[PDB]
Amino acid sequence: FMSSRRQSVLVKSNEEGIQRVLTSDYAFLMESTTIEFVTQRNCNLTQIGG
Amino acid sequence: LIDSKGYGVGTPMGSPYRDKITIAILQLQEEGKLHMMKEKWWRGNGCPEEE
Ligand SMILES: *[C@@H]1O[C@H](CO)[C@@H](O)[C@H](O)[C@H]1NC(C)=O
Structure with a gap:
């Protein structure tokens, strides 16, 4: 998927990706410790x- | 969609007028001649969806 949707779903910051779940269908893989924050x-x- | 294609202006490899057309395709999003000519040619019938 990441090749086929390069520069399409790829965020470059955490909080913009937090915003991108907050907009639409988005899964936002990161480490659990920052997940424990948000x-x-x-x-x-x-x-x-x- | 399924992919993220785009169409490009065909130019010869090592075009003499590459930048003459490169930043010319950059400037067509500025006033939006790509966008102000988008409503005409793609919308031949204003199809009334209700269903
Ligand atoms: C998501 O966050 C809060 C609950 O934590 C909710 O009240 C808020 O409206 C939601 N944000 C949206 C829908 O943009």
């Missing part, structure tokens, strides 16, 4: 998978 300051963004 989830615990927003009751709208949870963590599928562990």
